[PDB]
Design an enzyme around this catalytic site. Structure first.
Site: not given
Ligand SMILES: *[C@@H]1O[C@H](CO[C@@H]2O[C@@H](C)[C@@H](O)[C@@H](O)[C@@H]2O)[C@@H](O[C@@H]2O[C@H](CO)[C@@H](O)[C@H](O)[C@H]2NC(C)=O)[C@H](O)[C@H]1NC(C)=O
Ligand SMILES: *[C@@H]1O[C@H](CO[C@@H]2O[C@@H](C)[C@@H](O)[C@@H](O)[C@@H]2O)[C@@H](O[C@@H]2O[C@H](CO)[C@@H](O)[C@H](O)[C@H]2NC(C)=O)[C@H](O)[C@H]1NC(C)=O
Ligand SMILES: CCCC[N+](C)(C)[C@@H](Cc1c[nH]c2ccccc12)C(=O)NCCC1CCCCCC1
Ligand SMILES: *[C@@H]1O[C@H](CO[C@@H]2O[C@@H](C)[C@@H](O)[C@@H](O)[C@@H]2O)[C@@H](O)[C@H](O)[C@H]1NC(C)=O
Ligand SMILES: *[C@@H]1O[C@H](CO)[C@@H](O)[C@H](O)[C@H]1NC(C)=O
Ligand SMILES: *[C@@H]1O[C@H](CO)[C@@H](O)[C@H](O)[C@H]1NC(C)=O
Ligand SMILES: *[C@@H]1O[C@H](CO)[C@@H](O)[C@H](O)[C@H]1NC(C)=O
Length: 526
Positions: A195, A322, A435
């Protein structure tokens, strides 16, 4: 159990892992603590010490706001800091195999957390399994996040921007100067991150200052071209001024705005960070990377487009779901505690939350591209559509566009599609392959049969750990021994990617092609 580094000796500790031993050096300082006059400034080099530094526990995590939407909920609080918050947080960790290796490839982890949160001491960033199982050295560092790491008065050395990135960079150079003393190869260094960590890796590929500090790069669920990953210079200044007014530190002299902000206590700065923008989202990054002219000489999308980056191999990937995590952080009708079936007007309200400054035409255009159902009365149509919207826009499509443009300049790139939902995942099933939840598989946590994972998960994590290690050591993420499907390079025409799951690992092509043409080509115009 003691190692002589360029600034003094450090003592480690031994750890038992899978009937073997890993040596951990937790909390080695790598910069002058950025306190007092040093707050908001680039990290300053560390002065020698004569003692033996005891590197036997994780050090302080950097000041940061804590996620409070679900107190006591593991799915939320596993990402919260597990050490004291402090400004004195520029430390790093090293896991070396036992016996001491001779020329081990080094894997350097950069954590995510939206450039506002995160710490290397998290349970899922524990590098001992990688060192034990693959004989690599794992390095991870804490870097300043939020305004304390990314407040920007462009050009002003009292707050030049990108300080957290320069923390990362000074830790990369620490590995260049010292890791050989631990048995590692400074010439075989692979950055990997997730990320905002992955976005940081991608900016190290563009920063000339970092080109000599690593060999290869791995980008998990992130890249700098994601809409949240770079703050404009207009945004940065409007945000630095709004922080100044909210702290009573407005001055005409720009540098004494900074000295005024430097006498405020860390918590006062943290308190006001969330209000420097009129309308935030569950994806707001109010203080992130900027084109500072130092770490980043130009708008990074131009550098990518025109091939201005370190030429090397990259491994890039995303997870199937995600976007879902962010839906229960503001979108109406959503909750981690029910199946979050929303209506058409709830979906529409959802877009206003994730795209607040977007024309009503833009929001209709998103709705149009995502709401022509193949079956029109699946009750979860709108629920899944909003997750796919947030995921495609914020992670999947920017990662694909990064991989395409990077690969167009001759380097091998490998793209993966992680689509396994962890058997222990504390979040509801409608949220899917969320995510952040490939990390534990990358770090080999499923390899410990002690801890509730299925045998399939052990096999998947074993293969991923092998692929990641081969990529770092050799630049090729294959598992060559167990008749695994080969992982082809990602090239701009065929765009092959490898799916990672427990049942069948497959080669597929052109991930989310029609969705990404909307976000990458049309949507930037509205
Ligand atoms: C740029 O900054 C101004 C100032 O923001 C206001 O003050 C800050 C301290 C913080 O508390 C913000 O939330 C405030 O909104 C922004 O101007 C404001 O914009 C909102 C909505 O557009 C409006 O309701 C306020 O009245 C405005 N206040 C003033 C003094 O103009 C502005 O929106 C920011 N963003 C951009 C892109 O310019
Ligand atoms: C799913 O839950 C949301 C969130 O509501 C909260 O969490 C629930 C589990 C329950 O404990 C509620 O009492 C909580 O308030 C629901 O969203 C709410 O829906 C009602 C009626 O539609 C509305 O009055 C509230 O404003 C909503 N809250 C929001 C939008 O934040 C949602 O209806 C639930 N959906 C399903 C299918 O169960
Ligand atoms: C409305 C509340 C704002 C939340 N704030 C802006 C602090 C972001 C800050 C932020 C964190 N990760 C980001 C990635 C991109 C952009 C911003 C962020 C955030 O906590 N979101 C939650 C998502 C993560 C937690 C849930 C578990 C799985 C992992 C996802
Ligand atoms: C640093 O550590 C030295 C060695 O102590 C080792 O670690 C502690 C936790 C005990 O387990 C001990 O038996 C180990 O040998 C200490 O002697 C020294 O005082 C420490 N110094 C500082 C400044 O903390
Ligand atoms: C480690 O490998 C590099 C080449 O990758 C080599 O130049 C260096 O001398 C090696 N160091 C050792 C074997 O100690
Ligand atoms: C005030 O601004 C000037 C430049 O306009 C700068 O030289 C000076 O250092 C600032 N004041 C202080 C106390 O630093
Ligand atoms: C390959 O298969 C063997 C069993 O024959 C297993 O022990 C090993 O862990 C596997 N390795 C990888 C990298 O999957």
């Amino acid at each position: 159990i003691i190692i002589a580094t360029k600034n003094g000796k450090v003592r480690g500790m031994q750890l038992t892992v899978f009937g073997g031993t890993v040596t951990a050096f937790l909390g080695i300082p790598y910069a002058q603590p950025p306190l007092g006059r040093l707050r908001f400034k680039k990290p300053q080099s560390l002065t020698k010490w004569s003692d033996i530094w005891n590197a036997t526990k994780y050090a302080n995590s950097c000041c940061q706001n804590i996620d409070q939407s679900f107190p006591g909920f593991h799915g939320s609080e596993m990402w919260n800091p597990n050490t004291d918050l402090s400004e004195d947080c520029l430390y790093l960790n090293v896991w070396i195999p036992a016996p001491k290796p001779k020329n081990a490839t080094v894997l350097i982890w950069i954590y995510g957390g939206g450039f506002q949160t995160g710490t290397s001491s998290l349970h899922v960033y524990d590098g001992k399994f990688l060192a034990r199982v693959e004989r690599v050295i794992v390095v991870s560092m804490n870097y300043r996040v939020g305004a304390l790491g990314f407040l920007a008065l462009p050009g002003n050395p009292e707050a030049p921007g990108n300080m957290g990135l320069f923390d990362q960079q000074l830790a990369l150079q620490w590995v260049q100067k010292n890791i050989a003393a631990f048995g590692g190869n400074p010439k075989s260094v692979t950055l990997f991150g997730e990320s905002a960590g992955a976005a940081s890796v991608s900016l190290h590929l563009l920063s000339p200052g970092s080109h000599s500090l690593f060999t290869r790069a791995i980008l998990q669920s992130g890249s700098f071209n994601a809409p949240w990953a770079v703050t404009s210079l207009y945004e940065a200044r409007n945000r630095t001024l709004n922080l100044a007014k909210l702290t009573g530190c407005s001055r005409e002299n720009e540098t004494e705005i900074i000295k005024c902000l430097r006498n405020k206590d860390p918590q006062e700065i943290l308190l006001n960070e969330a209000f420097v923008v009129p309308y935030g989202t569950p994806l707001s990054v109010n203080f992130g990377p900027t084109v500072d002219g130092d770490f980043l000489t130009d708008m990074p999308d131009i550098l990518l487009e025109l091939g201005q980056f370190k030429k090397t191999q990259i491994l890039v990937g995303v997870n199937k779901d995600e976007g879902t995590a962010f839906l229960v952080y503001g979108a109406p009708g959503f909750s981690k505690d029910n199946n979050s079936i929303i209506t058409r007007k709830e979906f529409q309200e959802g877009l206003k939350i994730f795209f607040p400054g977007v024309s009503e035409f833009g929001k209709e255009s998103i709705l149009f591209h995502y709401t022509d159902w193949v079956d029109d009365q699946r009750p979860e149509n709108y629920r899944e559509a909003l997750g796919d919207v947030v995921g495609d826009y914020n992670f999947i499509c920017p990662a694909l566009e990064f991989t395409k443009k990077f690969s167009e300049w001759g380097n091998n790139a490998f793209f993966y599609y992680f689509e396994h939902r962890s058997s222990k995942l504390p979040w509801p099933e409608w949220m899917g392959v969320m995510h952040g939840y490939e990390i534990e598989f990358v770090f080999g946590l499923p390899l410990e049969r002690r801890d509730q994972y299925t045998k399939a998960e052990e096999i998947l994590s074993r293969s991923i750990v092998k692929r990641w290690a081969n990529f770092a050591k050799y630049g090729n993420p294959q598992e060559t021994q167990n008749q695994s499907t080969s992982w082809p390079v990602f090239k701009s025409t065929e765009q092959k990617y490898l799916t990672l799951n427990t049942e069948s690992t497959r080669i597929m092509t052109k991930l989310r092609a029609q969705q990404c043409r909307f976000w990458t080509s049309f949507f930037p115009k509205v």
